[PDB]
Design a protein around this nucleic acid. Structure first.
Ligand SMILES: [Mg+2]
Ligand SMILES: [Mg+2]
Ligand SMILES: [Mg+2]
Ligand SMILES: [Mg+2]
Ligand SMILES: [Mg+2]
Ligand SMILES: [Mg+2]
Ligand SMILES: [Mg+2]
Ligand SMILES: [Mg+2]
Ligand SMILES: [Mg+2]
Ligand SMILES: [Mg+2]
Ligand SMILES: [Mg+2]
Lengths: 175, 139, 201, 123, 109
RNA sequence: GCUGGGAAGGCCCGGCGGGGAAGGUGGCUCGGGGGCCCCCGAGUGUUACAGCCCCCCCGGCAGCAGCACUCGCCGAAUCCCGGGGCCGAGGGAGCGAGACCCGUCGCCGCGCUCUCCCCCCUCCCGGCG
RNA sequence: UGGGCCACUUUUGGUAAGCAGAACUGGCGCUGCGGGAUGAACCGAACGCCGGGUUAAGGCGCCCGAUGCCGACGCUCAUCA
RNA sequence: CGGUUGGCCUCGGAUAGCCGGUCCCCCGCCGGGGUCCGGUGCGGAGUGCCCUUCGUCCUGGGAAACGGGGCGCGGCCGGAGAGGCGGCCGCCCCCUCGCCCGUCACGCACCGCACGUUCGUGGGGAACCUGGCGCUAAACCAUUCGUAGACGACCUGCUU
């Protein structure tokens, strides 16, 4: 499974109706995927690990993108995940600040790849929820929990280093 | 040192991006690289914006963080920024830059003639000024 | 652009400046790079010195006179980096290598010209400020360059002359501002034309 | 007016830049953004592509050439061309003297220098 | 009186790493360093002008030593200026690094 | 066009309201600096001389995957116009006249006439005001 | 023609081997081309002679075509990175 | 043999800071500090600045008038890192023209078309004419030497 920016889907599925149980139960997952094809694939993966159910003897009765409920309010997100290193597998709890749930999960994927060299096929996201400010554990979010927060932008590195490529004056980094 | 700070109510100038050349109020801060951002009187709806894309001005509005658009809009209007800016000389510097970009060919000819005559007059006055300032014969 | 491009090496990173110079000099563009003793290299001074001493160790052991020539001047060190980035075994690369010219300090066809700056190779732009760097002049002097004291005194002379010329230029600019304040009443007709089309904020 | 073969009929006001009534190609002119309102300017009807088409005299009745025809290389400006030029310039030029600096602008020529690039120039 | 052409540089031929295609030329035009600025030059005539020993006939003039290979810009080549052009004869390799005129002919402005 | 017959968002001080809390506003207590008077820092708390979140008894209006560039998948639910580049292979297609200087022809898409009325710019205009 | 050799997976002897011996498929031999700097076998793709367009694998500081994106988020300082 | 198609005649630098200008102290009436005042997404701005070319003729207006131009003369000063350059005074000789806004007409207006336009009196090589100022050498061989030497090379001497 590759990436991009992720979307959250809810995928609801069931086993196929045999003439023993004419109404098999429905199951629902929240799945963070680049698109709905990857969403259905990851659904069948997870539900096959959990229940004895395969894509052949089953169906997707619904696969639909969950939109962000409040995409203009900055939320804290707690991610409960498991992954596996080159050695055995580990449980983990991360915290992020974002506007969207899928944005925070994408942030978690790039962060796990950065800090633990973990690939997306190694990561399994098992819980994601919206944390308030007073329930957070990580200092990288609790330092932004301040109502009168204030900081400068100290060392502004020039970015247009090629427009111009040859100038006569050296750039300034204080602004 | 550090006269401008990223804070709630700070007005920044979006320099590149889809909202380039715009004015923006900082509503909240999202984690060290982005800010929740809303320009209601400069026609920029609320979104996340990179500090790499914004440049801080000297104007600070007054509202609590994560307030609504009507509150940031009336805080913009009471001591409106569209008249403080534009009669700041950053803004008219930008304005001169864009009209110099829009300057046509006949306009370029007239600018050449006017600038040529103006430089002639200034140069002759400079020559007179230094030839008068050389009148020094004191022990 | 048919004129020579004159760059100031002080404050620039070696390989980045060399890459820019090499592409320019392949595309045409006679380039002079002055003050090659002010070129910076990233990484600390000791490991840069060790890299140069390993290069000094590289020697044709049958005939070191035939072997690789370890130039010691900072100008020639920069020139050899650009040589490494050029296709110098061809006539095109040799013509580009001839189109490039490098100097220690600023010799006097170029001390009375404007020097340009390449911000994509500047140390303040390309290095984090909490990182160690080295000086090509100090590195050259400790691997065997003889002429860093004479270059320093000649640069001090050049800086004194440049200060004198700069004070002249400042007095001329003050006189020009005074002349505008004197005859503004006869250029008011021409000034408003320029303000209308974006010159003269 | 643009002529009936696609070619543009232009005039410099010949007393300004020595350009008569000529045809010129649309692909080989650059169009600027300055206007002269030329409604109610009488254009003679005898101002067509046949009027502007080149003239030939060589060669009558002769097949071998060793003597040369030293005449007709002097292209003569005909009197009807001169009086058409006089009429159209007499009804265009007072309108050109109206707007300022335009006659100096039309006397001048266009050029590129060490700065300006044509993709950035507004015309 | 005045220049009337934009100055470009013959940067090289169209090529991969170990194969060059000499029917297309790569041109670096002075002042343009993005594709959406190369859009202006997209059909302009371009010329490699050079001198030689013998005299050639000049259109509308007397014979002299100047010779011209004509071509035109065909499209953009990669994210930073750098158009690719197509000449009547393939350009000589001694012209790499030299000046090529872009002539403002057929005009769309 | 579809979607949670989009999600959010805008305006209507949204209004009767009902709560709740801190990244705690005002007011107060305490600590610092400026001519008893002002602002910043620490505790208090629930609207106050700011605001935020949830439920409405119901929302209304405008807009609508926005011509304020927040976040999609699309087109029998899709069309119009323009620009650059490369290329022009082929060569007797005439059912009629009994081909006549020389096949402007097939298929496909159209327009007018062999009906009669109008009306609008015109025109060798005829005399012209 | 009846000397074969190599690679994924399976597999025998051997401490192992660019060792010896099998199975299956593909290759090389008999095969050039793009990439892997370089290379019988890898990766892409198989080839009449050309123009235009687009790609694969692979790349895009400079050699060297292409990031001269105001690319995104982190991690890392090495006196053998 | 060809390239080329306006120039930039210059602070040092800092980057968690800069740049400019003035009132009071000090340096044989300029430079250095301390106030104070501006500007800082650099406008005293290299995304910058300077030059700008169709040419003449009658005719006005301001800009100028303390000027322009003499490869015209003479003199002085500065520049050594690769000075190969730059700047200023005195003599006289032509014009009040050239810069901006106007009036008036004319020029091959070569009948749509390419290499036009500069640097440029470019660089290099032979040859002819034309005047003014000047100058009248060395090297190698041969010969000697033997501080040298396989041969070349090298060190020496040769009318006073
Ligand atoms: Mg044919
Ligand atoms: Mg055999
Ligand atoms: Mg084997
Ligand atoms: Mg064989
Ligand atoms: Mg075969
Ligand atoms: Mg093969
Ligand atoms: Mg290969
Ligand atoms: Mg390899
Ligand atoms: Mg092809
Ligand atoms: Mg490569
Ligand atoms: Mg390249």
């Amino acid at each position: 499974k590759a990436s991009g920016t992720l979307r959250e889907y809810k995928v609801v599925g069931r086993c196929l109706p045999t003439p023993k149980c004419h109404t098999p139960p429905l199951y629902r997952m929240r799945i963070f995927a680049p698109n709905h094809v990857v969403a259905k694939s990851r659904f069948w993966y997870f539900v096959s690990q959990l229940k004895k159910m395969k894509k052949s003897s089953g169906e997707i009765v619904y696969c639909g993108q969950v939109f962000e409920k409040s995409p203009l309010r900055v939320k804290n997100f707690g991610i409960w995940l498991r992954y596996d290193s080159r050695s055995g597998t580990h449980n983990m709890y991360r915290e992020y600040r974002d506007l969207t749930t899928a944005g925070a999960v994408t942030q978690c994927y790039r962060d796990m790849g950065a800090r633990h060299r973990a690939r997306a096929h190694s990561i399994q996201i098992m819980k994601v929820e919206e944390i308030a400010a007073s329930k957070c554990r990580r200092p990288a979010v609790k330092q932004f929990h301040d109502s009168k927060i204030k900081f400068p932008l100290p060392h502004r590195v020039l970015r247009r280093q090629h427009k111009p490529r040859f100038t006569t004056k050296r750039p300034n980094t204080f602004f | 040192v550090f006269r401008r700070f990223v804070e709630v109510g700070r007005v920044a100038y979006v320099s590149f991006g889809p909202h380039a050349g715009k004015l923006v109020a900082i509503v909240d801060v999202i984690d060290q690289n982005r800010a929740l951002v809303d320009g209601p009187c400069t026609q920029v709806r609320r979104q996340a914006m990179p500090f790499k894309c914004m440049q801080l001005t000297d104007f600070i509005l007054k509202f609590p963080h994560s307030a609504h658009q009507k509150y940031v809009r009336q805080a913009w209007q009471k001591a409106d920024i569209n008249t403080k800016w534009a009669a700041t000389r950053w803004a008219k510097k930008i304005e001169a830059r864009e009209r110099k970009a829009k300057m046509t060919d006949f306009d370029r000819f007239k600018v050449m003639k006017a600038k040529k005559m103006r430089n002639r007059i200034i140069k002759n006055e400079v020559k007179k000024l230094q030839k008068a300032a050389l009148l020094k014969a004191s022990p | 652009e048919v004129q020579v491009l004159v760059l100031d090496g002080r404050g620039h990173l070696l390989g980045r400046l060399a890459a820019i110079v090499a592409k320019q000099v392949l595309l045409g563009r006679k380039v002079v790079v002055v003050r090659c003793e002010g070129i910076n290299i990233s990484g600390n001074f000791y490991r840069n010195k060790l890299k140069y001493l390993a290069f000094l160790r590289k020697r044709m052991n049958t005939n070191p006179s035939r072997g690789p020539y370890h130039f010691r001047a900072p100008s020639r060190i920069f020139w050899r980096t650009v040589r490494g980035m050029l296709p110098h075994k061809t006539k095109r690369g040799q013509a580009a290598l001839d189109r490039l010219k490098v100097f220690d300090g600023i010799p006097p066809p170029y001390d009375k010209k404007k020097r340009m700056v390449v911000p994509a190779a500047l140390k303040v732009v390309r290095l984090k400020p909490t990182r160690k760097f080295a000086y090509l002049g100090r590195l050259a002097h400790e691997v065997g360059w003889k002429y860093q004291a004479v270059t320093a005194t000649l640069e001090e002379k050049r800086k004194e002359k440049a200060k004198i010329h700069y004070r002249k230029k400042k007095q001329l600019m003050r006189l020009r501002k005074q002349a505008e304040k004197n005859v503004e009443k006869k250029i008011d007709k021409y000034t408003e034309v320029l303000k209308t089309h974006g010159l003269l904020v | 007016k643009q002529l009936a073969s696609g070619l543009l009929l232009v005039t410099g006001p010949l007393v300004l830049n020595r350009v008569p009534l000529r045809r010129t190609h649309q692909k080989f002119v650059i169009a600027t953004s300055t206007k002269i309102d030329i409604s109610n300017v009488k254009i003679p009807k005898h101002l067509t592509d046949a009027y502007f088409k080149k003239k030939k005299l060589r060669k009558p009745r002769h097949q071998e050439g060793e003597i040369f025809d030293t005449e007709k290389e002097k292209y003569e400006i005909t009197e009807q061309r001169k009086i058409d030029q006089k009429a159209v310039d007499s009804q265009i030029l007072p309108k050109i003297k109206a707007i300022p600096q335009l006659q100096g602008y039309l006397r001048s020529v266009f050029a590129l220098t060490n700065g300006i690039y044509p993709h950035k120039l507004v015309f | 009186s005045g220049r009337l052409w934009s100055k470009a540089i013959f940067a090289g031929y169209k090529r991969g790493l170990r194969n060059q295609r000499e029917h297309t030329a790569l041109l670096k035009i002075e002042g343009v360093y993005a594709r959406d600025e190369t859009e202006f030059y997209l059909g302009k005539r371009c010329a490699y002008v050079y001198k030689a020993k013998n005299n050639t006939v000049t259109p509308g003039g007397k014979p002299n030593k100047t010779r011209v290979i004509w071509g035109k810009v065909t499209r953009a080549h990669g994210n930073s200026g750098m158009v690719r052009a197509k000449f009547r004869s393939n350009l000589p390799a001694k012209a790499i690094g030299h000046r090529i005129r872009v002539m403002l002919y057929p005009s769309r402005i």
